[PDB]
Chains A and B, each alone.
Chain A
């Protein structure tokens, strides 16, 4: 029922600024922790900023601090994002995503920074840390494993989350808090964390699992940011030849 409705796609000239809206419509309306995540065509997902602590008005990723402005109209439940000084490198799909455990934040509780709900995405086009294997593969029924290496400041200190991204869709929470599976995710998917590394295991591989898989964790470096993995394109190969004598 609860959904994030984003503004439509648009073309901006280089140098100009773009504003994207994200209205929270449906169900449990009140207070949320919306973050802005972008994804350039054929590229991985990248966290730009958003509300990530009880301490300040907004937190921006170091890369975006100079050009991003993140605002919110509490009266209308709409969250805005304004990116100025646009270049061809800013052509991407801009998503807004809500942090799932916002209701528990108290300055002592360490959030998982898992993205509960996502917007459909807004395509903005300009015209005039975590190590993951680029690809993985397996025949149907096999158990494929994706590794996700990090540092002490991210995986060593915080929980790991996994997202599955099907073509033409926003990433979806697959595993949260290292091993947990949100309702809908089958028992076939399983997570695991050890020291500064994490792993996703897709047991009993199905053709429907051919998607991009991203790994994510909070990084305590600087004022904090959510870091993502490069992504892994899991390809479901054709089943092996069958012996006819048995």
Chain B
């Protein structure tokens, strides 16, 4: 239907795009496909799609959605990524309400691990929201949609006022040049609140009303929320960006250290502070694909027919 992909159904939408589930014809695996029509796109929008792709190519992490292939025709651009079977966290909150702090701590640990790794590779998401935090088949977080993402240098100020309004930091609304990671830490605070409360800390009927709420920095802490969790959120949702917790301080918070000892979380946050599958290559050789050409597509970050098949087969 579209290259080596037979399209199943529309699973979501995006800026001038439609996301559709599809099946790889040679590997029978499921993928997500963003179909962008280039006819409704301008020079600035096309550059914002190239940057999104170039950022997704730099990020290989267990809690980040993996880009497999990029296909481009004279009128269309298709982005093929791994399929998050469980869908958005937002839809899971609509179905079951607020998450228990034990269950929320597990997901939040996964969410910060991915965001820490992004900041590690000098990248800021800038669009963290419940509808962008997807779940795999085992209900584990997979961060997605790097449309607003950008590269940063520590100590620099960004000038792109983008993000999901309910999760956007106050400085974004004010049009102030900001520090990238601090904007993501505000978003993470909102994410943690919506996970444990099943509602937003700042909400309104219109964007004008939402903005007024975000700029006030005042929000209700419900009775069910622990004093340890309240402390963490109150130290992330701080109007002055400099008085917000750092990603390292968030990881070592009393709420984060609560419950059972998690050495797997520690060995993943330490990895951010920094083989070839010959069996797959033999199977690809049988399908009529050259071993040296497969290696050359992997070496060059082409994200072509050979890149996608190796990646899909490694599951």
Contacts and interface: CB of A to CB of B under 8 A. Distances in A.
Contacts of A59: 199-200, 203
Interface string B141-161: 000000000000000000000
Interface residues of A, number: 29
A17 interface: no
Interface stretch (A107-115, A161-169, A232-240): A107-115
A57 B133 CA distance: 14
A223 B94 contact: no
B199 A60 contact: yes
A90 to B, nearest CB: 16
B220 A222 contact: yes
Contacts of B209: 220, 224
A208 interface: no
Contacts of B90: 57
Contacts of A70: 97
B95 A72 contact: yes
A53 B205 contact: yes
A56 B203 contact: yes
Contacts of A56: 166, 194, 199-200, 203
Contact of A223 (B91, B202, B207): B202
B206 interface: yes
A74 B87 CA distance: 14
Contacts of B202: 223
Interface residues of B, number: 29
B11 interface: no
B94 A111 contact: no
A82 interface: yes
Contacts of B166: 55-56
A55 B210 contact: yes
Contacts of A25: none
A69 B204 contact: no
A53 B198 contact: no
Contact of B199 (A57, A72, A108, A220): A57
Interface string A111-130: 10000000000000000000
Contacts of B197: 65
B199 A111 contact: no
Interface in B206-239: 206-207, 209-210, 213, 220, 222-224
A135 interface: no
Contact of B223 (A66, A71, A72, A73): A66
Given A56-B194, A65-B199, A71 B205 contact: no
A120 to B, nearest CB: 25
B289 interface: no
Interface in B60-82: none
B220 A55 contact: no
B165 A55 contact: yes
A174 B90 CA distance: 35
Contact of A62 (B96, B194, B207, B220): B220
Nearest to B96: A71
Instruction: List the 8 shortest-distance A-B pairs measured between CB atoms, nearest first.
Output: A223-B203, A56-B200, A69-B97, A66-B223, A55-B166, A57-B93, A57-B94, A107-B207
23 contacts: A53-B205, A55-B200, A55-B210, A56-B194, A57-B90, A57-B194, A58-B97, A58-B198, A65-B197, A66-B224, A69-B198, A72-B94, A72-B95, A74-B94, A74-B95, A82-B97, A111-B205, A218-B205, A223-B199, A223-B202, A223-B213, A224-B205, A224-B209
Interface of A: 52-53, 55-60, 62, 65-66, 69-74, 82, 107-111, 158, 218, 220, 222-224
